[PDB]
Amino acid sequence: STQYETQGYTINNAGRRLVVDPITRIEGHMRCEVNINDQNVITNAVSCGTMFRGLEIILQGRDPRDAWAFVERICGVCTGVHALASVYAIEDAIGIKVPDNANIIRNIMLATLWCHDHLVHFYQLAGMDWIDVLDALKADPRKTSELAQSLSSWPKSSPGYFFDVQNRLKKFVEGGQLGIFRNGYWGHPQYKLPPEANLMGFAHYLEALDFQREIVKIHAVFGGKNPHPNWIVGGMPCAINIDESGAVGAVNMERLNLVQSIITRTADFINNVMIPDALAIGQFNKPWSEIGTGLSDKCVLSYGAFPDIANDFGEKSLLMPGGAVINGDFNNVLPVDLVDPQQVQEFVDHAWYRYPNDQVGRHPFDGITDPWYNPGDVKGSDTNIQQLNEQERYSWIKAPRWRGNAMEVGPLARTLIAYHKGDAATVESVDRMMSALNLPLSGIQSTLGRILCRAHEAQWAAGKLQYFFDKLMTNLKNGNLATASTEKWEPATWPTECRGVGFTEAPRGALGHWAAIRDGKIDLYQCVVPTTWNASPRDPKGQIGAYEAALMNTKMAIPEQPLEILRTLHSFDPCLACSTH
Amino acid sequence: STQYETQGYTINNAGRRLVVDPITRIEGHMRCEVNINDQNVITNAVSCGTMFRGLEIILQGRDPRDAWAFVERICGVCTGVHALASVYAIEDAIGIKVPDNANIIRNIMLATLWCHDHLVHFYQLAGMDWIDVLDALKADPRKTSELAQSLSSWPKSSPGYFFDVQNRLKKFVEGGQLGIFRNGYWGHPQYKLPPEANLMGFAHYLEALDFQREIVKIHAVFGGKNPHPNWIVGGMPCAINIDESGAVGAVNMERLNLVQSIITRTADFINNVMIPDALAIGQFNKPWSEIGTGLSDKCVLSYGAFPDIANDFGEKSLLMPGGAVINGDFNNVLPVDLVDPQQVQEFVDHAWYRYPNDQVGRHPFDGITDPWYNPGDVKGSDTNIQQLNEQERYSWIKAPRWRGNAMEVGPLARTLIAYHKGDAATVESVDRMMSALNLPLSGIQSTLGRILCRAHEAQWAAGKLQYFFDKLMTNLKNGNLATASTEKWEPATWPTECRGVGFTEAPRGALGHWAAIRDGKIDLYQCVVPTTWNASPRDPKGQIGAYEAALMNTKMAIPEQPLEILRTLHSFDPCLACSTH
Amino acid sequence: KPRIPVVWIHGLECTCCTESFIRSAHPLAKDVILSLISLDYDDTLMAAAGTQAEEVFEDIITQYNGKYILAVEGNPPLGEQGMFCISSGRPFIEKLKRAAAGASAIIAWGTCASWGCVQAARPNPTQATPIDKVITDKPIIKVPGCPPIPDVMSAIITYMVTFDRLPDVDRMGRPLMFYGQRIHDKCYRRAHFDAGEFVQSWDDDAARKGYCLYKMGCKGPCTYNACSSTRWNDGVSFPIQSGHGCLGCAENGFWDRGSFYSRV
Amino acid sequence: KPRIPVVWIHGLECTCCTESFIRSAHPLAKDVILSLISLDYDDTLMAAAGTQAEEVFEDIITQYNGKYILAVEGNPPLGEQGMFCISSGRPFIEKLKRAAAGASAIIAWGTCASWGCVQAARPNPTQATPIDKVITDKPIIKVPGCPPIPDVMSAIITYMVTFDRLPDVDRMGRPLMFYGQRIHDKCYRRAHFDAGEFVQSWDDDAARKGYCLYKMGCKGPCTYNACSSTRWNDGVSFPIQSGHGCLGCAENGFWDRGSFYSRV
Ligand code: SF4
Ligand code: SF4
Ligand code: FCO
Ligand code: FCO
Ligand code: SF3
Ligand code: SF3
Ligand code: F3S
Ligand code: F3S
Ligand SMILES: [Cl-]
Ligand SMILES: [Cl-]
Ligand SMILES: [Li+]
Ligand SMILES: [Li+]
Ligand SMILES: [Mg+2]
Ligand SMILES: [Mg+2]
Ligand code: NI
Ligand code: NI
């Protein structure tokens, strides 16, 4: 066994080794291993991406106009975000400016995704870490109604409703066919909700499973379908016609009316179901404001997102702020430049890739994706990993760093960047939320904080949907219908050699696509994705990434039941297909 | 002035005359006049249909296969029922037997219409006679929640919901634009609900306005559109393909899945919103169990409906019983024969039509529609009527009789026939409903009883929707896909001269279409429609129709405010375009 | 802010156009009534009847003279001195003329108000007459169909409220947005029409594969509407999709262009 | 009344097929899971992780040997001894073969499980391989599309539950009900294709009238799916209705049939 110090942690691989493979209730394939000491506290944590497909390799030789469609299939959970980053990157390389309505509709596509994705994560992915579904069978339906009505105006609160939900669950489990609830962690001492809160949360799980399908109708109107809507380089293909012959063939007033109806219902669901449920998880699980801090009080990163001034990606345009904090210095939010070769770099000394020198980090315009499955001694065989070798290569995820620092990205990172940049709405929202929980601001830098910030962001995005919709309608009232720029559609109009960066804030954090075009085709396409940051393996200095740091120092009540590990990993909303691409 | 005796009433047109023109919250154009004595009691009532279009004249010379599309446009409220009666009539004349799936789908179309039509009538047409909308502004939202939850398992009952609905109403009236509530009867002493029940009912008015649009999606699947779906002589045009190439062009598993989802939602809304509201109106308005009896304790009529054995219109097939009661003898349910010239006959001595002998009735196969606007010695003039002269012709509605008797039709009529024939489900339903109200069975023979039976029937039809759906799926599992018989589609295959009757129970009562075909064309097409029965003018014996009888002997609190007249008339669900056609 | 006053009157009709309106999926008819417009007179829905309804009608057309939109469902009959349709003991046409005189603009809902519809089919017993042949001094927007598509009716309303202007119309007064193209120029069965792939009798193998309905009498080739694009009842279906040819129901005189089952 | 056991496994994937499944409008995915099937293993949705999830997997395939349906999302990579996709420390292909051996039938969800999809596009770095090239002794129903239509997925499930039989399939194993006809043979823009009425550049006058997308690279003429009839997201849209040509996403090798913007 060995021990070393990094980022204030003592990384110690003595003691019992626990393996969690597969991690479930995530997107895609992840393995996690830890070591625990004699007090059942984690002293080592190992984050492993257990899949790879190679989109950066497949994209070579493609037409830049086609790239969005390929890279959209990096992930069907954060569907659309990679298409957006792609059309941004190709437009940046060629020098294309899109019309305002295209930019507004892209912002609607991204805000729709934030709403949908955050809602399904809260309920279907993370929810069962916090709600003991089986304990809901012991609830009093009248006390459940009272609880629900104390927390929310939401209509669906009758005692009969909660009894009908409870009875449906009772009938579902009575035959032993427990389905997704089979062999769960039910009854673990870290389940702290009372039975009435479990039945309220379970009812809302089912309501969210139903309602989430409606949110993406906005993607179907502008993008044809969800999952995986369509896009174009130069804007969007959803031509608008309000008052001319043939409006039946275009985005017309009836199509826009459908979008407005979904926006209203989406805000109402998020504000009256998910927001009160997130605050209730906080009220009943306050100790989790002190667990899973990880890098969230050290190093956090946002690129920023939602340019409100079309084709302006600067600070005055982005509605979601960008910036970096390192060394715990929140008084100095630093600017990020995605072209600077000293800023974003990826290491592979602990990943299944080859570089000519694995001791140095490569900026993505110098990126290399040469897969090399080389696990070393894993106490089994190359086809039987019993214990990853975290002293050598242990993941399909590359290790991104920012100026050599290991960073956390995602909702909590973004909230801390906007708060410390002095965004008024954020400061007021965060302070009121932590006040209501009777917790200090530092309580947000935690596993509970990641969940609270994600829910807050769903609310923010539902508000921005209306703002963007109103901006689109203002343009239409002023006779501004344009949705595409085609001056540079034809390859004969492009630079013979050019390169560009497309960046945004995906639901899970900072996303960048770096593209080099030569002779009308993709010469290089490198992606660094939010879960690549968070789920990162170690670097040549031994620095740990956000997952490994957040798991360090965590108490486990029952080592064989990884509920604490799941709670913290799920709080980051892992997407492993995103991380590996 | 004159006084005469008929059907146990004293018809006296001395004393003050009141006019209600227009009657609102009905379909189409109606005028009502009454005389009231010094004690504010109605001693005379006059039912006048104030519209005519002449579909029976327009149909002459048309192709029998087209007739359903024309007569469907008798009415957009009871949309589809005239199309069903039409295809029945033409199939009866020619000798066409449809495949079982076509009969099952027609039964689904009719049950769908019963559910939709009854729900909208309860809330949007009759509801504001019982619910004091402005009094809902005085309710306590928590007491409203507690009331709703005491009556139903329906989920949408939170205090915050009732507060939000109450604030929407408060904002609506705050600018002084009261819209459909302007100059209503609010605060009339006959409004008896407490404020909490008014707010519960008003919330439900809004929920029903929203929900009714979903029900008719079943019509859109099988019939293309609602209002006014499509049909064919020979079956239905909605060809089925479950498991073959090209199912995308037909009624396939996805289309059947959509139907099933609407059926479940429709039953849940009717059973948990409409049924408990109907009972609540009964609980707070018991005196109306003794008002508006009219003909309902004397003469009631049902033709019967929903043949479960395809092409069998007999007693063993019809799921909704047929029969007639006269002389108050409910121990003698009499069979109805629509070909017997001595049974159904229409009189026009008090209607705006010409007969060779206006002192006799004509069976519809001998029917004549020769319009003659002759109001005679009115107060005012023929183009400025101040008072109809009910001693002469006073209506565009013909006067149907059964064996010379004046009959009531509709939900109460059908409930009484089915109850007294011993239908187990009807007896159980009615006995349970009247037991919950602590009222005698006789209490259903009233204005309140018409409303209770209508709500009962919406629940009955919702259940039958599932039954018919399951029968259709059983056929499809057995490889029985047929939806049309076309061996007699072509006119050359028809009898040179033939006649037929098509009958059913529309939402408002007994409907018949009598058709004569000669030389490939419609020779005669006569309709007798449920509101024609109920809104009937007098006959040569002076016998009054169901509306006029139900209004007789009614007390009015405020003569100038016709709330008691509207309550009784709306309880029959008048459709004046139907009545006149 | 105050909402735009709307007066909705009813002549000879079947009430299919009111029923279509309340089907609207987006915006819901509830939200149109509570938030978008002020629906100040409507016999089908209003609380008041008789003298109380007459007082509403008079108060609104007086207080909002020149400022209300008049919606017309159905049509006036000229036969029998207009007493085929009686309102408050007088010919309906007098109410239509009084309502029209104060209106800023008129929406003719449905084939009835636009053209005549079923009561005007031969031999037109009542001499039912479309609105634009009686009212000749007001803008009239025709929204034809029997009835028109629910979400077309609500989209036209939202367009007018949002953009504060009448929709642009064709030479017949129909909104170009929904009536600019024929059913047949946006029909999903057009591949079959082009290939000569037709239903020949009901429920034949062609019918079970969704082949073209031209030989069964489909009038889509001569009919302008949005049914094959926008579709009906929240996009669920339209006549052709459910296996019946278009009747031509958005076109003037469609009842008298021959049998629905005779080909164009 | 026991529900049919279902094991849902995940190879190399993007999870778009699970996401599509939960979009189902009728039946709701909630009602499929609670009432129609027993979804007994599914890494995206299940409570258990790690050793607890391994116990569920082993218990279900043993207890229900010969009687469960195997749903497969994604595909196995043959490169690096299968360790481009690792599950419980071993190649995913081992889990695929264990789950297949006990299944009564296999549903290959999406273009990944059916054909290969994006990871199999040139130069296929991982040697991603469709299910039917690995599992050669079981009924495999291919439900292709990237992803398939939500209500197509749920209609296929309800068919199998209601009718107690596999759907009838074409020569490639695709259900005839939804894959028997081409997008272009049920496309509402076919009138424009017939007339030579084409979009020539994005947002031109043709685009704003809904003209045909053939010259913008639409692959509808060579693609079998239900998008132009059943449509997407409760019938709200499909690719062509929102102005982009069909990419061809239901067909084997569609990524490598040239630029999406090159005409057929
Ligand atoms: S079904 Fe009618 S509208 Fe459609 S293609 Fe055939 S003829 Fe044209
Ligand atoms: S848009 Fe595509 S599928 Fe539709 S008609 Fe044109 S080429 Fe065919
Ligand atoms: N959100 C998201 Fe997916 C990840 N990680 C991307 O980008
Ligand atoms: N219901 C109904 Fe209409 C009437 N009266 C018909 O038939
Ligand atoms: Fe629409 S009221 Fe119904 S008949 Fe044809 S429109 Fe008229
Ligand atoms: Fe659908 S998991 Fe998403 S990539 Fe194309 S199907 Fe695969
Ligand atoms: S009949 Fe009418 S509803 Fe549409 S499809 Fe034809 S115009
Ligand atoms: S891209 Fe795919 S989703 Fe349908 S329209 Fe074409 S098969
Ligand atoms: Cl006409
Ligand atoms: Cl492929
Ligand atoms: Li740019
Ligand atoms: Li018959
Ligand atoms: Mg990368
Ligand atoms: Mg008649
Ligand atoms: Ni993702
Ligand atoms: Ni009617």
What does the alpha-carbon distance between residue A58 and residue A529 come to, in Å, rounded to a whole number?
Answer: 17
Determine whether C51 is exposed, middle or buried from the number of CB atoms within 10 Å of its CB (0-12, 13-18, 19+): middle
User: Are the Cβ atoms of A157 and B152 closer than 8 angstroms?
Assistant: no
Of the candidates A157, A139, A145, A166, the one whose C-alpha atom is nearest the C-alpha of residue B155 is A157
| Residues within 6 Å of ligand 1 by CB | C 183-184, 187, 189-190, 193, 212-214, 218, 220-221, 240, 245-246
Q: Which two tokens stand for residue A228?
A: 């995986």
Name the residue facing B209 among C14, C29, C242 (closest C-beta). Answer: C29
Mutation choice for ligand 5 from C146, C152, C174, C223, CB with most ligand atoms inside 8 A: C146
**Selection from B558, B336, B569 nearest residue B447 by Cα:** B569
3-state secondary structure of B123: helix
Task: State the DSSP string of A456-509.
Answer: HHHHHHHHHHHHHHHHHHHHHHTT----B--TT-SGGGS-SEEEEEEEEEETTE
Residues 6 or more apart in contact with residue D140 via CB below 8 angstroms? D105, D106, D107, D108, D131, D132, D173
* Number of the ligand 3 atom closest to the C-alpha atom of A75: 3
Q: What share of chain C is helix, strand, coil (3-state, %, to 5)?
A: 35, 20, 45
What does the alpha-carbon distance between residue A306 and residue A315 come to, in Å, rounded to a whole number? 11
Q: Could you tell me which of C13, C7, C25 has the C-alpha nearest to residue C149?
A: C25
Q: Residue B436 — φ and ψ, nearest 5°?
A: -65, -30
Sketch out chain B's domains with CATH numbers. 1-581 (1.10.645.10)
| Number of alpha helices (DSSP H) and beta strands (DSSP E) in chain B | 17, 16
Q: Give which of B231, B238, B230 is closest to B91, Cα–Cα.
A: B231
Q: Is D112 annotated as a binding residue?
A: yes
Q: Tell me the residue type at A379.
A: K
List chains touching A (3+ CB pairs under 8 A). Answer: B, C, D
CB contacts of D77 in chain A (<8 Å) are 52
Residue in chain C lying closest to D227 (CA):
C188
The token pair that represents B558 in the structure block: 């405020």
Give, using CA atoms, the residue closest to atom 8 of ligand 2: D184
Method: X-ray
Q: Which atom of ligand 7 is nearest to the CA of C145?
A: 2
Structure tokens, D200? 């020539």
Tokens 């009624």, located at residue: B251
- What does C114-149 look like in DSSP terms, one character per residue? HT--GGGSTT-TT-B--GGGT--SS-EEEE-SSS--
Closest CA to B240 of B249, B232, B231: B249
* Ligand 7 centre distance from Cα of residue C201 (Å): 21
Q: Both tokens of residue B338?
A: 């629509």
CA dist., res. A111 & res. A96, Å (int): 23
> How many CB atoms sit inside 10 A of residue D31's CB?
18
Are C30 and C154 within 8 A, CB to CB?
no
Task: Describe the crossing of helices B563-571 and B447-477 by its angle, rounded to 10 degrees.
Answer: 30
Q: Is the CB of B76 under 6 A from ligand 5?
A: yes
With CA atoms as reference, report the closest residue to A55 among B87, D14, D63.
D14
Which tokens go with A37? 């000491």
Helix A447-477 crosses helix A253-269 at what angle (to 10 degrees)? 160
Best A218, A241, A254 member to test C by mutation, with max C CBs in 10 Å, is A254
Resolution of the experimental model in angstroms, please?
A: 1.4
- For residue B104, what are its two tokens? 């099952």
How many other CB atoms sit within 10 Å of the CB of residue A493? Answer: 12
Tell if the CB–CB gap between A242 and C154 is shorter than 8 Å: no
The answer to the question of whether A575 is labelled as a binding residue is yes
Interchain proximity C90–B63, CB inside 8 Å: no
Could you give all domains of chain C from N- to C-terminal order, each with its CATH number? 1-178 (3.40.50.700), 179-264 (4.10.480.10)
| Residue found under tokens 């499930």 | D157
Mutation to probe ligand 3, out of A26, A29, A81, A536 (largest number of atoms < 8 A from CB): A81
CA B172, CA C130: separation in Å to the nearest integer? 35
**Is position B578 annotated in a ligand binding site?**
yes
In this complex, do B153 and A164 lie within 8 Å of one another by their Cβ atoms? yes
What's the start-to-end Cα distance of chain B, in Å? 33
Residue type, A539: D
Whether the CB-CB separation of A62 and A521 falls below 8 Å is answered with yes
Give the torsion sign (CA, B132, B138, B141, B143): negative
Residue C39 pairs in a beta bridge with C6
The helix or strand, by DSSP H or E, that contains position D51, with its residue range, turns out to be: helix D50-63
Contact A153 B145 (CB under 8 A): no
Residue A322 CB contacts under 8 Å (≥ 6 apart), including other chains: A302, A303, A304, A305, A315, A335, A336, A417
Element (H, E) at A71: helix A67-72
Dihedral over Cα of C134, C138, C141, C147: its sign: negative
Residue A400 CB partners (closer than 8 Å, separation 6+): A344, A345, A346, A347, A407, A528, A532, A533, A536
- The rounded distance, in Å, linking the Cα atoms of A433 and B191 is 47
Longest dimension (CA), chain A: 76
Query: Dihedral (C-alpha) A450, A455, A461, A465: value to the nearest 10 degrees?
Result: 160
Q: Which residue has tokens 């249909």?
A: B49
CA of A309 relative to ligand 11 center, distance in Å: 11
Q: How far apart are the first and last CA of chain C?
A: 51
D226 exposure class (CB count in 10 Å sphere: 0-12, 13-18, 19+):
buried
d(CA C203, CA C193): 18
Which two three-digit tokens encode residue D198? 């084409």
Atom of ligand 6 nearest to the CA of D110: 6
Burial A198-226 (b: 16+ CB within 10 A, else e): bbbbbbbbbbbbbbbbbbbbbbbbbbbbb
- Sign of torsion over alpha carbons B327, B331, B337, B342: negative
Cα-Cα-Cα-Cα torsion B439, B442, B447, B450, nearest 10 degrees, comes to: 90
- Residues in CB range of B225: below 8 A, 6 or more apart: B219, C227, C232, C233, C237, C238, C239, C242
Could you write out the DSSP letters of every residue in A154-182? -SB--HHHHHHHHHHHHHHHHTS--GGGT
Q: How far is CA B266 from CA A101, B77, B270, B272, B273, in A?
A: 40, 18, 6, 10, 11
Indicate left, alpha or beta for A354 from its phi (over 0: left) and psi (-120 to 50: alpha).
beta
Taking the CA of B310 as reference, the closest ligand is: 12
- CB-based burial of residue D117 (10 Å sphere; 0-12 exposed, 13-18 middle, 19+ buried)? buried
C-alpha span between A235 and A251 (Å, rounded): 14
CB of B94 sitting under 6 A from ligand 4: no
Sole residue written with tokens 């219908």: A481
Locate the ligand 5 atom nearest the alpha carbon of residue B73 and give its number: 4
Helix residue ranges per DSSP H, B226-284: 253-269, 275-284
Strands C4-10 and C68-73: parallel
Cβ-based neighbour number of residue A91 at 10 Å: 21
SS3 state at D39: strand
The Cα B103–Cα B98 span in angstroms is: 7
B502: phi then psi, degrees, rounded to nearest 5: -120, 125
Measured between beta carbons, which residues in chain B are less than 8 angstroms from residue C119? 53-55, 58
Tell me how many degrees the CA angle D175-D177-D183 measures, rounded to the nearest 5.
95
- B chain contacts of residue C261, beta-carbon cutoff 8 Å: 63, 65-66
Distance of CA D135 to the CA centre of its chain: 17
